[PDB]
């Protein structure tokens, strides 16, 4: 027969399998972009709905 | 003798400075006339021609 689940019952229980991360996970360089705005604002096209 | 190349240029000693005319890059060019609006500060250039 299949295990119960925990939150199923009344039980508390202290053991219990916890996952984690195995390092901090914010450690890396943020993120950056080049953002290279339009060459004429006349010429843009904001039409094609 | 010696002559390396020999062209057929827009008179400057007519077309002077008077006129607003710079035959030195061997086209005519004006400095404020039909400028476009809306562009980065080097984008006026190829009106002056």
């Known amino acids: ?49 | 003798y010696g002559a390396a190349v020999v062209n057929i240029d827009l008179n400057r000693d007519f077309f002077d400075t008077a006129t607003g005319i710079d035959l030195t890059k061997g086209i005519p060019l004006v400095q404020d006339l039909l400028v476009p609006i809306g562009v980065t500060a080097g984008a006026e250039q190829s009106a002056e021609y």
Do not use: C, W, Y
């Open chain 1, 1 to 49: 027969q299949v295990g119960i689940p925990k939150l199923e019952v009344d039980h508390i229980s202290f053991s219990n399998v916890v996952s984690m991360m195995t390092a901090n996970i914010r450690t890396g360089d943020d993120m950056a972009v080049e953002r290279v705005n339009p060459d004429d604002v006349r010429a843009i096209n904001i039409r094609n709905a």
